[PDB]
């Protein structure tokens, strides 16, 4: 019995459509997480040397919902932009609660990525306890949108042939479908060094560039699928990911939130309510 958290400091996405200015924007790899001043939020960047130049810019912490950033790519090899929620704290999903991310933002058209790309929630999870020592890290995917390729449109829906894995079910949650998919990572690089994984995805059936994600519910969805997160989220942040291609993104609002089944508050940005 969960109830949508109605709190004023909540920006509605579908009109948070005001161009946000003065980014500090970061070129290089981080090497991790690294945290943010006067925020809640950290950032992450994989930007291969190897590939072309990109680019990442938090918009800051008073404005845009705290966590909205813009990245901008010029060939990429698999460029990984990502800004919110860091734990690692050896604490469960289920700690944290309803977890809520509100978002507005503009991207580059079709085929302007490279042949894979996601937009969405991102992170990982340690399940040390697991009996099957392949589901003891598990990297995760929400997928709102991508860029589609030469050979599917941005509109359709990605499936296995750009994840891999296997389809495990379906819910429906936030206006759409979305499709489950589980894959195996066989001895490819990880938070902790080269090892096999699984990677959990849910893929929304109808692509958007705003709305409101209700991601406990996915990770509530995974769980009763078998698909288990373990006792240690390593993150819980919104991610630009771009294969390849020439592009950008640029975010009006990222706004998380998290809330008690009856709907209020326990952590949200901005801090304040709105004198006139």
């Given at each position: 019995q969960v109830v949508k958290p109605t709190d004023e400091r909540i920006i509605d996405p579908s009109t948070a459509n005001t161009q946000l200015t003065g980014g500090v924007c970061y070129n290089t790899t981080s090497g991790g997480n690294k945290?943010?001043?006067?925020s809640p939020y950290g950032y992450e960047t994989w930007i291969d040397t190897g590939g072309g130049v990109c680019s990442f810019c938090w918009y800051g912490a008073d404005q845009g919902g705290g966590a909205a950033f813009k990245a901008t790519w010029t060939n990429p090899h698999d460029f990984l932009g990502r800004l919110g929620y860091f734990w690692n704290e050896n604490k469960p999903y289920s700690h944290y609660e309803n977890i809520y991310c509100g978002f507005n933002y503009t991207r580059s058209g079709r085929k302007t990525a490279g042949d894979y790309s996601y937009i969405g929630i991102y992170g990982w999870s340690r399940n040390p306890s697991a009996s099957n020592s392949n589901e003891r890290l598990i990297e995760y995917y929400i997928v709102e949108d991508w860029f589609g390729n030469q050979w599917q449109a941005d509109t359709s829906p990605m499936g296995i042939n750009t994840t891999g894995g296997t389809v495990m079910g379906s819910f429906t949650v936030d206006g759409s479908?979305?499709?489950?998919?589980?894959?195996?990572?066989?001895?490819?690089?990880?938070?902790?060094?080269?090892?096999?994984?699984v990677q959990y995805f849910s893929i929304r059936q109808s692509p958007r560039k705003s709305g409101t994600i209700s991601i406990t519910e996915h990770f509530?969805?995974?769980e009763k699928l078998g698909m288990k997160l373990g006792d240690n989220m390593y993150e819980c942040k919104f991610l630009i990911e771009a294969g390849a291609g020439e592009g950008f993104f640029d975010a009006r609002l990222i706004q998380f939130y998290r809330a008690d089944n009856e709907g209020n508050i326990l952590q949200i940005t901005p801090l304040e309510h709105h004198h006139h």
């Open positions: 945290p943010l001043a006067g479908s979305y499709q489950i998919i589980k894959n195996t990572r066989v001895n490819q690089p990880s938070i902790e060094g080269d090892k096999t994984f509530k969805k995974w």
